[PDB]
Write an enzyme that holds these catalytic residues in place. Structure first.
Site, PDB file in Angstrom:
ATOM      1  N   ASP A  80      -0.831   4.165 -12.566  1.00 47.84           N
ATOM      2  CA  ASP A  80       0.177   4.099 -11.369  1.00 47.84           C
ATOM      3  C   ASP A  80      -0.736   3.266 -10.339  1.00 47.84           C
ATOM      4  O   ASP A  80      -1.838   3.570  -9.926  1.00 47.84           O
ATOM      5  CB  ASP A  80      -0.064   5.635 -11.025  1.00 47.84           C
ATOM      6  CG  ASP A  80       0.594   6.090  -9.883  1.00 47.84           C
ATOM      7  OD1 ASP A  80       0.954   5.207  -9.023  1.00 47.84           O
ATOM      8  OD2 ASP A  80       0.851   7.214  -9.597  1.00 47.84           O
ATOM      9  N   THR A  81      -0.166   2.236 -10.033  1.00 51.80           N
ATOM     10  CA  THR A  81      -0.738   1.228  -8.960  1.00 51.80           C
ATOM     11  C   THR A  81      -0.624   1.820  -7.648  1.00 51.80           C
ATOM     12  O   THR A  81      -1.180   1.545  -6.555  1.00 51.80           O
ATOM     13  CB  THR A  81       0.135   0.049  -8.954  1.00 51.80           C
ATOM     14  OG1 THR A  81       1.580   0.379  -8.673  1.00 51.80           O
ATOM     15  CG2 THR A  81       0.331  -0.609 -10.024  1.00 51.80           C
ATOM     16  N   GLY A  82       0.326   2.895  -7.368  1.00 52.92           N
ATOM     17  CA  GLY A  82       0.251   3.533  -6.246  1.00 52.92           C
ATOM     18  C   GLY A  82      -0.952   4.590  -5.828  1.00 52.92           C
ATOM     19  O   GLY A  82      -1.187   5.156  -4.638  1.00 52.92           O
TER      20      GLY A  82
HETATM   21  C1  LIG Z   1       7.529   9.534  -5.941  1.00 52.23           C
HETATM   22  C2  LIG Z   1       6.334  10.412  -6.916  1.00 52.23           C
HETATM   23  C3  LIG Z   1       5.206   9.562  -7.261  1.00 52.23           C
HETATM   24  C4  LIG Z   1       4.265  10.179  -8.240  1.00 52.23           C
HETATM   25  C5  LIG Z   1       4.598  10.732  -9.425  1.00 52.23           C
HETATM   26  C6  LIG Z   1       3.728  11.298 -10.170  1.00 52.23           C
HETATM   27  C7  LIG Z   1       4.297  11.883 -11.376  1.00 52.23           C
HETATM   28  C8  LIG Z   1       4.783  11.191 -12.556  1.00 52.23           C
HETATM   29  C9  LIG Z   1       5.297  11.624 -13.629  1.00 52.23           C
HETATM   30  C10 LIG Z   1       5.750  12.995 -13.831  1.00 52.23           C
HETATM   31  C11 LIG Z   1       5.324  13.844 -12.640  1.00 52.23           C
HETATM   32  C12 LIG Z   1       4.525  13.351 -11.578  1.00 52.23           C
HETATM   33  C13 LIG Z   1       3.209   9.049  -8.394  1.00 52.23           C
HETATM   34  C14 LIG Z   1       2.155   8.830  -7.115  1.00 52.23           C
HETATM   35  O1  LIG Z   1       1.614   7.678  -7.279  1.00 52.23           O
HETATM   36  C15 LIG Z   1       2.207   9.840  -6.519  1.00 52.23           C
HETATM   37  C16 LIG Z   1       0.766   9.770  -5.319  1.00 52.23           C
HETATM   38  C17 LIG Z   1       0.719   8.633  -4.509  1.00 52.23           C
HETATM   39  C18 LIG Z   1       2.041   8.394  -3.789  1.00 52.23           C
HETATM   40  C19 LIG Z   1      -0.760  10.123  -5.858  1.00 52.23           C
HETATM   41  C20 LIG Z   1      -0.928   9.650  -7.362  1.00 52.23           C
HETATM   42  C21 LIG Z   1      -2.259  10.131  -7.454  1.00 52.23           C
HETATM   43  C22 LIG Z   1      -3.081  10.332  -6.635  1.00 52.23           C
HETATM   44  C23 LIG Z   1      -2.867  10.681  -5.293  1.00 52.23           C
HETATM   45  N1  LIG Z   1      -3.995  11.012  -4.307  1.00 52.23           N
HETATM   46  S1  LIG Z   1      -4.862   9.856  -3.578  1.00 52.23           S
HETATM   47  O2  LIG Z   1      -5.687  10.418  -2.764  1.00 52.23           O
HETATM   48  O3  LIG Z   1      -5.465   9.029  -4.699  1.00 52.23           O
HETATM   49  C24 LIG Z   1      -3.636   8.967  -2.637  1.00 52.23           C
HETATM   50  C25 LIG Z   1      -3.326   9.375  -1.550  1.00 52.23           C
HETATM   51  C26 LIG Z   1      -2.426   8.540  -0.858  1.00 52.23           C
HETATM   52  C27 LIG Z   1      -1.827   7.215  -1.304  1.00 52.23           C
HETATM   53  C28 LIG Z   1      -0.674   6.653  -0.707  1.00 52.23           C
HETATM   54  F1  LIG Z   1      -1.014   5.307  -0.711  1.00 52.23           F
HETATM   55  F2  LIG Z   1       0.111   6.991  -1.028  1.00 52.23           F
HETATM   56  F3  LIG Z   1      -0.703   6.874   0.778  1.00 52.23           F
HETATM   57  C29 LIG Z   1      -2.372   6.964  -2.425  1.00 52.23           C
HETATM   58  N2  LIG Z   1      -3.181   7.700  -3.098  1.00 52.23           N
HETATM   59  C30 LIG Z   1      -1.600  10.435  -4.795  1.00 52.23           C
HETATM   60  C31 LIG Z   1       2.547  10.934  -6.381  1.00 52.23           C
HETATM   61  O4  LIG Z   1       2.389  12.209  -6.009  1.00 52.23           O
HETATM   62  O5  LIG Z   1       3.615  11.340  -7.633  1.00 52.23           O
END
Ligand SMILES: CCC[C@@]1(CCc2ccccc2)CC(O)=C([C@H](CC)c2cccc(NS(=O)(=O)c3ccc(C(F)(F)F)cn3)c2)C(=O)O1
Lengths: 99, 99
Positions: B25-27
Protein backbone atom coordinates in the site's frame (compact mmCIF):
# COMPACT_ATOMS: atom_id res chain seq x y z
CA UNK A 1 7.92 9.36 -13.90
CA UNK A 2 9.48 7.09 -11.26
CA UNK A 3 8.18 7.79 -7.76
CA UNK A 4 10.02 6.66 -4.63
CA UNK A 5 8.25 6.16 -1.32
CA UNK A 6 10.40 8.07 1.18
CA UNK A 7 7.67 10.71 1.17
CA UNK A 8 3.98 10.40 0.36
CA UNK A 9 3.52 9.76 -3.36
CA UNK A 10 1.50 12.91 -3.94
CA UNK A 11 0.70 14.03 -7.48
CA UNK A 12 -1.15 16.99 -8.95
CA UNK A 13 -4.46 16.11 -10.53
CA UNK A 14 -6.92 18.20 -12.46
CA UNK A 15 -10.60 17.38 -12.00
CA UNK A 16 -13.56 19.60 -12.90
CA UNK A 17 -11.12 22.33 -13.92
CA UNK A 18 -9.56 22.45 -10.43
CA UNK A 19 -5.95 21.59 -9.58
CA UNK A 20 -5.72 19.38 -6.47
CA UNK A 21 -3.14 17.18 -4.76
CA UNK A 22 -3.83 13.45 -4.54
CA UNK A 23 -2.18 10.38 -3.04
CA UNK A 24 -1.26 7.41 -5.23
CA UNK A 25 -2.56 4.50 -3.17
CA UNK A 26 -1.98 0.94 -4.41
CA UNK A 27 -3.98 -0.32 -1.42
CA UNK A 28 -7.14 1.33 -2.69
CA UNK A 29 -9.37 -0.43 -5.24
CA UNK A 30 -11.14 2.83 -6.04
CA UNK A 31 -10.46 6.57 -6.31
CA UNK A 32 -11.90 8.62 -3.42
CA UNK A 33 -12.03 12.42 -3.53
CA UNK A 34 -12.77 15.06 -0.90
CA UNK A 35 -16.20 16.68 -1.29
CA UNK A 36 -16.54 18.65 -4.53
CA UNK A 37 -19.06 19.27 -7.28
CA UNK A 38 -19.13 16.76 -10.14
CA UNK A 39 -21.54 16.55 -13.10
CA UNK A 40 -24.23 13.95 -13.70
CA UNK A 41 -26.00 11.50 -11.45
CA UNK A 42 -24.46 9.60 -8.56
CA UNK A 43 -25.11 6.19 -7.01
CA UNK A 44 -24.66 5.02 -3.42
CA UNK A 45 -21.62 2.99 -2.42
CA UNK A 46 -20.04 1.85 0.82
CA UNK A 47 -16.29 1.32 0.97
CA UNK A 48 -14.04 -0.11 3.65
CA UNK A 49 -10.85 1.40 4.99
CA UNK A 50 -8.67 0.62 7.99
CA UNK A 51 -11.07 2.47 10.28
CA UNK A 52 -14.23 0.83 8.99
CA UNK A 53 -16.87 1.56 6.36
CA UNK A 54 -17.84 4.93 4.84
CA UNK A 55 -20.80 5.91 2.64
CA UNK A 56 -19.67 7.63 -0.56
CA UNK A 57 -21.23 9.06 -3.72
CA UNK A 58 -20.19 7.24 -6.89
CA UNK A 59 -19.81 9.24 -10.10
CA UNK A 60 -18.95 7.43 -13.33
CA UNK A 61 -16.83 8.40 -16.37
CA UNK A 62 -15.21 11.46 -14.81
CA UNK A 63 -12.18 12.86 -16.65
CA UNK A 64 -9.11 13.58 -14.54
CA UNK A 65 -5.65 14.68 -15.67
CA UNK A 66 -2.95 13.02 -13.59
CA UNK A 67 0.51 14.48 -14.31
CA UNK A 68 -0.81 15.53 -17.71
CA UNK A 69 -2.16 12.07 -18.58
CA UNK A 70 -5.87 11.94 -19.30
CA UNK A 71 -7.82 9.17 -17.59
CA UNK A 72 -11.61 8.74 -17.42
CA UNK A 73 -13.29 6.62 -14.78
CA UNK A 74 -15.21 6.13 -11.59
CA UNK A 75 -14.66 8.51 -8.69
CA UNK A 76 -16.11 8.18 -5.20
CA UNK A 77 -16.77 11.34 -3.16
CA UNK A 78 -17.00 11.31 0.61
CA UNK A 79 -15.20 11.68 3.96
CA UNK A 80 -11.51 11.01 3.43
CA UNK A 81 -8.20 12.09 5.01
CA UNK A 82 -7.07 13.18 1.54
CA UNK A 83 -7.70 12.75 -2.19
CA UNK A 84 -6.81 9.13 -3.07
CA UNK A 85 -6.02 7.78 -6.53
CA UNK A 86 -6.75 4.05 -6.52
CA UNK A 87 -5.97 1.15 -8.83
CA UNK A 88 -8.96 1.85 -11.08
CA UNK A 89 -7.18 4.97 -12.33
CA UNK A 90 -3.60 3.85 -11.79
CA UNK A 91 -4.18 1.02 -14.28
CA UNK A 92 -5.26 3.63 -16.85
CA UNK A 93 -1.90 5.30 -16.23
CA UNK A 94 -0.07 2.03 -16.87
CA UNK A 95 1.32 2.49 -13.36
CA UNK A 96 3.29 -0.44 -11.90
CA UNK A 97 5.04 -1.31 -8.62
CA UNK A 98 8.71 -2.14 -9.13
CA UNK A 99 11.40 -3.59 -6.87
CA UNK B 1 9.49 -7.88 -9.72
CA UNK B 2 7.21 -5.56 -11.63
CA UNK B 3 3.68 -5.73 -10.27
CA UNK B 4 0.77 -4.40 -12.34
CA UNK B 5 -2.31 -3.13 -10.57
CA UNK B 6 -5.17 -4.96 -12.30
CA UNK B 7 -5.56 -6.87 -9.02
CA UNK B 8 -4.68 -6.06 -5.41
CA UNK B 9 -0.89 -6.24 -5.02
CA UNK B 10 -0.84 -8.97 -2.39
CA UNK B 11 2.41 -10.61 -1.23
CA UNK B 12 3.55 -13.26 1.28
CA UNK B 13 5.31 -12.04 4.42
CA UNK B 14 6.95 -13.69 7.41
CA UNK B 15 6.71 -11.82 10.72
CA UNK B 16 7.09 -12.88 14.34
CA UNK B 17 7.47 -16.46 13.14
CA UNK B 18 4.12 -16.31 11.33
CA UNK B 19 3.51 -16.55 7.57
CA UNK B 20 0.83 -14.19 6.26
CA UNK B 21 -0.50 -12.37 3.23
CA UNK B 22 -0.37 -8.59 3.11
CA UNK B 23 -1.28 -5.75 0.79
CA UNK B 24 1.41 -3.46 -0.65
CA UNK B 25 0.00 0.00 0.00
CA UNK B 26 1.87 3.04 -1.28
CA UNK B 27 -0.69 5.30 0.37
CA UNK B 28 -0.05 4.03 3.91
CA UNK B 29 2.60 5.91 5.93
CA UNK B 30 2.93 2.91 8.22
CA UNK B 31 2.69 -0.87 8.23
CA UNK B 32 -0.37 -2.19 10.07
CA UNK B 33 -0.99 -5.87 10.72
CA UNK B 34 -4.04 -7.69 12.10
CA UNK B 35 -3.87 -8.23 15.88
CA UNK B 36 -1.03 -10.54 16.93
CA UNK B 37 1.69 -10.96 19.53
CA UNK B 38 5.05 -9.33 18.80
CA UNK B 39 8.17 -9.31 21.02
CA UNK B 40 9.21 -6.25 22.99
CA UNK B 41 7.57 -3.22 24.55
CA UNK B 42 4.90 -1.28 22.68
CA UNK B 43 3.23 2.13 22.76
CA UNK B 44 -0.47 2.83 22.04
CA UNK B 45 -1.27 4.91 18.97
CA UNK B 46 -4.31 6.02 17.05
CA UNK B 47 -3.88 5.98 13.28
CA UNK B 48 -6.32 7.46 10.81
CA UNK B 49 -7.54 6.20 7.49
CA UNK B 50 -10.69 5.72 5.49
CA UNK B 51 -13.49 4.88 7.91
CA UNK B 52 -11.89 6.69 10.82
CA UNK B 53 -9.20 5.90 13.40
CA UNK B 54 -7.94 2.58 14.70
CA UNK B 55 -6.24 1.93 18.03
CA UNK B 56 -2.99 0.09 17.50
CA UNK B 57 0.06 -1.17 19.38
CA UNK B 58 3.32 0.21 18.01
CA UNK B 59 6.31 -2.17 18.03
CA UNK B 60 9.73 -0.89 17.01
CA UNK B 61 12.51 -2.53 14.98
CA UNK B 62 10.51 -5.57 13.93
CA UNK B 63 12.10 -7.75 11.25
CA UNK B 64 9.74 -8.68 8.40
CA UNK B 65 10.57 -10.83 5.40
CA UNK B 66 8.67 -9.73 2.28
CA UNK B 67 9.01 -11.83 -0.88
CA UNK B 68 12.25 -13.19 0.56
CA UNK B 69 13.78 -9.81 1.40
CA UNK B 70 14.46 -9.04 5.07
CA UNK B 71 13.50 -5.55 6.17
CA UNK B 72 13.29 -3.85 9.56
CA UNK B 73 10.90 -1.17 10.77
CA UNK B 74 8.09 -0.08 13.03
CA UNK B 75 5.07 -2.39 12.84
CA UNK B 76 1.62 -1.43 14.09
CA UNK B 77 -0.80 -4.10 15.23
CA UNK B 78 -4.57 -3.75 15.72
CA UNK B 79 -8.03 -4.47 14.35
CA UNK B 80 -7.30 -3.55 10.71
CA UNK B 81 -9.48 -5.54 8.28
CA UNK B 82 -6.37 -6.55 6.32
CA UNK B 83 -2.58 -6.76 6.69
CA UNK B 84 -1.04 -3.69 5.06
CA UNK B 85 2.60 -3.07 4.20
CA UNK B 86 3.25 0.67 4.22
CA UNK B 87 5.91 3.03 2.87
CA UNK B 88 8.10 2.59 5.94
CA UNK B 89 8.88 -0.95 4.79
CA UNK B 90 8.39 -0.57 1.01
CA UNK B 91 11.29 1.90 0.81
CA UNK B 92 13.53 -0.74 2.37
CA UNK B 93 12.66 -3.04 -0.52
CA UNK B 94 13.61 -0.34 -3.03
CA UNK B 95 10.02 -0.22 -4.25
CA UNK B 96 8.99 2.53 -6.69
CA UNK B 97 5.85 3.51 -8.60
CA UNK B 98 6.44 3.89 -12.33
CA UNK B 99 4.25 5.24 -15.14
C1 LIG C 1 -9.87 3.82 -0.09
C2 LIG C 1 -9.62 2.76 0.96
C3 LIG C 1 -8.14 2.62 1.08
C4 LIG C 1 -7.59 1.61 2.07
C5 LIG C 1 -8.11 0.22 1.85
C6 LIG C 1 -7.61 -0.77 2.89
C7 LIG C 1 -8.28 -2.11 2.66
C8 LIG C 1 -7.87 -2.91 1.60
C9 LIG C 1 -8.47 -4.14 1.37
C10 LIG C 1 -9.48 -4.57 2.22
C11 LIG C 1 -9.89 -3.78 3.30
C12 LIG C 1 -9.29 -2.54 3.52
C13 LIG C 1 -6.09 1.73 1.87
C14 LIG C 1 -5.44 2.85 2.61
O1 LIG C 1 -4.21 3.20 2.14
C15 LIG C 1 -5.99 3.43 3.70
C16 LIG C 1 -5.31 4.55 4.55
C17 LIG C 1 -4.68 5.70 3.79
C18 LIG C 1 -5.67 6.31 2.86
C19 LIG C 1 -4.32 3.98 5.59
C20 LIG C 1 -3.75 2.72 5.46
C21 LIG C 1 -2.85 2.24 6.42
C22 LIG C 1 -2.49 3.02 7.52
C23 LIG C 1 -3.07 4.29 7.66
N1 LIG C 1 -2.77 5.16 8.79
S1 LIG C 1 -1.43 6.11 8.69
O2 LIG C 1 -1.12 6.73 9.96
O3 LIG C 1 -0.29 5.29 8.35
C24 LIG C 1 -1.82 7.27 7.40
C25 LIG C 1 -2.66 8.36 7.68
C26 LIG C 1 -3.00 9.25 6.64
C27 LIG C 1 -2.49 9.01 5.36
C28 LIG C 1 -2.86 9.92 4.22
F1 LIG C 1 -1.90 10.08 3.31
F2 LIG C 1 -3.89 9.34 3.62
F3 LIG C 1 -3.33 11.08 4.67
C29 LIG C 1 -1.68 7.89 5.15
N2 LIG C 1 -1.36 7.06 6.15
C30 LIG C 1 -3.98 4.76 6.70
C31 LIG C 1 -7.31 2.92 4.11
O4 LIG C 1 -7.86 3.30 5.13
O5 LIG C 1 -8.02 1.96 3.37
Amino acid sequence: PQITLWQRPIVTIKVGGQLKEALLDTGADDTVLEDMELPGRWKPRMIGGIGGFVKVRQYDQIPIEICGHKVIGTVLVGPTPTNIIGRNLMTQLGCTLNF
